[PDB]
Amino acid sequence: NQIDLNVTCRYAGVFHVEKNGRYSISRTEAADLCQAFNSTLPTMDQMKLALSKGFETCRYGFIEGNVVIPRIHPNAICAANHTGVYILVTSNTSHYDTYCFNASAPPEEDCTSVTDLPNSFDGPVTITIVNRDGTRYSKKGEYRTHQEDI
Numbered sequence: 001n002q003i004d005l006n007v008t009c010r011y012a013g014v015f016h017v018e019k020n021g022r023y024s025i026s027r028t029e030a031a032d033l034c035q036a037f038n039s040t041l042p043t044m045d046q047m048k049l050a051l052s053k054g055f056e057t058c059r060y061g062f063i064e065g066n067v068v069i070p071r072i073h074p075n076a077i078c079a080a081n082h083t084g085v086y087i088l089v090t091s092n093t094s095h096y097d098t099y100c101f102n103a104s105a106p107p108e109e110d111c112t113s114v115t116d117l118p119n120s121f122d123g124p125v126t127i128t129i130v131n132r133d134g135t136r137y138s139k140k141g142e143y144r145t146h147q148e149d150i
Protein backbone atom coordinates (compact mmCIF):
# COMPACT_ATOMS: atom_id res chain seq x y z
CA ASN A 1 0.00 0.00 0.00
CA GLN A 2 2.43 2.59 -1.37
CA ILE A 3 2.51 5.95 -3.19
CA ASP A 4 5.60 7.68 -4.62
CA LEU A 5 5.42 11.45 -5.07
CA ASN A 6 8.11 12.80 -7.43
CA VAL A 7 8.78 16.47 -6.64
CA THR A 8 10.80 19.25 -8.30
CA CYS A 9 12.74 22.34 -7.25
CA ARG A 10 10.54 25.24 -6.18
CA TYR A 11 10.57 28.47 -8.17
CA ALA A 12 8.93 31.39 -6.44
CA GLY A 13 7.22 28.71 -4.31
CA VAL A 14 5.83 26.77 -7.30
CA PHE A 15 6.75 23.07 -7.84
CA HIS A 16 5.64 20.07 -9.86
CA VAL A 17 4.37 16.82 -8.27
CA GLU A 18 3.93 13.55 -10.18
CA LYS A 19 2.28 10.48 -8.62
CA ASN A 20 4.05 7.15 -9.26
CA GLY A 21 5.87 8.72 -12.25
CA ARG A 22 2.83 8.72 -14.57
CA TYR A 23 -0.21 10.93 -15.22
CA SER A 24 -2.53 9.74 -12.47
CA ILE A 25 -3.88 12.64 -10.44
CA SER A 26 -7.50 13.85 -10.72
CA ARG A 27 -8.43 17.50 -10.11
CA THR A 28 -9.81 16.65 -6.64
CA GLU A 29 -6.74 14.61 -5.72
CA ALA A 30 -4.51 17.49 -6.89
CA ALA A 31 -6.18 19.87 -4.39
CA ASP A 32 -5.73 17.28 -1.57
CA LEU A 33 -2.13 16.69 -2.55
CA CYS A 34 -1.19 20.38 -2.47
CA GLN A 35 -2.96 20.67 0.90
CA ALA A 36 -0.78 17.83 2.24
CA PHE A 37 2.24 19.94 1.31
CA ASN A 38 0.70 22.99 3.10
CA SER A 39 0.40 24.39 -0.44
CA THR A 40 -2.39 25.41 -2.84
CA LEU A 41 -2.88 25.03 -6.59
CA PRO A 42 -1.09 27.98 -8.17
CA THR A 43 -2.79 30.87 -9.91
CA MET A 44 -1.70 31.70 -13.45
CA ASP A 45 0.04 34.81 -12.10
CA GLN A 46 1.94 32.71 -9.56
CA MET A 47 2.94 30.29 -12.34
CA LYS A 48 4.10 33.11 -14.61
CA LEU A 49 6.41 34.44 -11.86
CA ALA A 50 7.81 30.91 -11.33
CA LEU A 51 8.46 30.67 -15.10
CA SER A 52 10.33 33.97 -14.96
CA LYS A 53 12.63 32.58 -12.21
CA GLY A 54 13.53 29.52 -14.29
CA PHE A 55 10.71 26.98 -13.88
CA GLU A 56 9.98 24.65 -16.77
CA THR A 57 8.76 21.01 -17.09
CA CYS A 58 7.72 18.70 -19.91
CA ARG A 59 4.55 17.50 -18.13
CA TYR A 60 0.89 18.57 -18.02
CA GLY A 61 -0.22 19.54 -14.51
CA PHE A 62 -3.17 21.24 -12.82
CA ILE A 63 -3.05 24.82 -11.66
CA GLU A 64 -6.14 26.69 -10.41
CA GLY A 65 -8.51 26.57 -13.37
CA ASN A 66 -6.33 25.04 -16.11
CA VAL A 67 -3.89 22.31 -17.07
CA VAL A 68 -0.54 23.77 -18.19
CA ILE A 69 3.12 23.17 -19.01
CA PRO A 70 5.58 25.97 -18.14
CA ARG A 71 8.19 26.24 -20.95
CA ILE A 72 11.33 28.35 -21.18
CA HIS A 73 13.19 26.64 -24.06
CA PRO A 74 11.28 25.60 -27.16
CA ASN A 75 11.34 21.79 -27.59
CA ALA A 76 9.40 19.95 -30.33
CA ILE A 77 8.19 17.20 -27.98
CA CYS A 78 7.18 19.49 -25.04
CA ALA A 79 3.99 21.52 -25.52
CA ALA A 80 4.67 21.49 -29.28
CA ASN A 81 7.61 23.98 -29.29
CA HIS A 82 5.73 26.71 -27.38
CA THR A 83 7.33 28.86 -24.68
CA GLY A 84 5.56 30.60 -21.80
CA VAL A 85 2.88 28.98 -19.72
CA TYR A 86 1.31 26.66 -22.32
CA ILE A 87 -2.39 25.97 -21.68
CA LEU A 88 -3.83 22.58 -22.62
CA VAL A 89 -6.95 23.31 -24.70
CA THR A 90 -8.36 19.99 -25.98
CA SER A 91 -8.10 16.62 -24.24
CA ASN A 92 -10.43 13.65 -23.71
CA THR A 93 -8.98 12.68 -20.36
CA SER A 94 -8.98 13.92 -16.76
CA HIS A 95 -5.80 12.69 -15.03
CA TYR A 96 -2.51 14.66 -15.08
CA ASP A 97 0.23 15.72 -12.69
CA THR A 98 -0.16 18.77 -10.43
CA TYR A 99 1.61 21.99 -9.63
CA CYS A 100 1.56 23.26 -6.06
CA PHE A 101 2.41 26.61 -4.54
CA ASN A 102 4.04 27.02 -1.12
CA ALA A 103 4.03 30.64 0.14
CA SER A 104 6.81 29.85 2.66
CA ALA A 105 9.35 28.79 0.02
CA PRO A 106 12.28 31.06 -1.04
CA PRO A 107 11.45 33.81 -3.58
CA GLU A 108 13.57 32.54 -6.46
CA GLU A 109 15.03 29.08 -7.29
CA ASP A 110 15.06 26.53 -4.44
CA CYS A 111 16.68 23.28 -5.59
CA THR A 112 17.00 21.78 -2.14
CA SER A 113 15.30 18.48 -1.31
CA VAL A 114 11.73 18.20 -0.03
CA THR A 115 11.87 16.43 3.30
CA ASP A 116 8.30 16.29 4.63
CA LEU A 117 4.64 16.10 3.81
CA PRO A 118 3.74 18.32 6.74
CA ASN A 119 -0.03 18.19 6.49
CA SER A 120 -0.73 14.54 5.63
CA PHE A 121 -3.14 12.87 8.01
CA ASP A 122 -3.31 9.52 9.77
CA GLY A 123 -3.62 6.55 7.40
CA PRO A 124 -2.35 3.17 6.10
CA VAL A 125 -0.39 4.30 3.01
CA THR A 126 3.40 4.39 2.85
CA ILE A 127 3.96 7.73 1.10
CA THR A 128 7.40 8.33 -0.32
CA ILE A 129 8.63 11.75 -1.42
CA VAL A 130 11.18 11.28 -4.20
CA ASN A 131 13.48 14.16 -5.12
CA ARG A 132 15.11 14.47 -8.52
CA ASP A 133 18.56 13.75 -6.95
CA GLY A 134 17.02 10.55 -5.58
CA THR A 135 16.82 11.66 -1.94
CA ARG A 136 13.77 9.99 -0.34
CA TYR A 137 11.55 10.70 2.64
CA SER A 138 8.86 8.23 3.72
CA LYS A 139 5.90 8.34 6.13
CA LYS A 140 2.75 6.36 6.85
CA GLY A 141 -0.40 8.38 6.27
CA GLU A 142 -3.04 9.56 3.82
CA TYR A 143 -3.87 12.78 1.91
CA ARG A 144 -6.91 11.79 -0.18
CA THR A 145 -10.24 13.07 1.17
CA HIS A 146 -12.50 11.90 -1.69
CA GLN A 147 -13.52 8.22 -1.99
CA GLU A 148 -13.55 8.27 -5.83
CA ASP A 149 -9.79 8.92 -5.54
CA ILE A 150 -8.96 5.93 -3.28
Ligand SMILES: Cc1nc[nH]c1CN1CCc2ccccc2C1
Pocket residue numbers: 006007008018021022059130131132
Ligand atom coordinates in the same frame (compact mmCIF):
# COMPACT_ATOMS: atom_id res chain seq x y z
C1 LIG B 1 10.47 11.99 -17.79
C2 LIG B 1 9.15 11.69 -17.08
N1 LIG B 1 8.26 10.79 -17.48
C3 LIG B 1 7.25 10.81 -16.59
N2 LIG B 1 7.53 11.74 -15.65
C4 LIG B 1 8.70 12.28 -15.96
C5 LIG B 1 9.43 13.37 -15.15
N3 LIG B 1 9.78 12.89 -13.79
C6 LIG B 1 10.72 11.75 -13.88
C7 LIG B 1 10.95 11.11 -12.47
C8 LIG B 1 11.13 12.12 -11.48
C9 LIG B 1 11.61 11.72 -10.21
C10 LIG B 1 11.80 12.66 -9.19
C11 LIG B 1 11.52 14.01 -9.42
C12 LIG B 1 11.05 14.43 -10.67
C13 LIG B 1 10.84 13.50 -11.71
C14 LIG B 1 10.36 13.98 -12.97
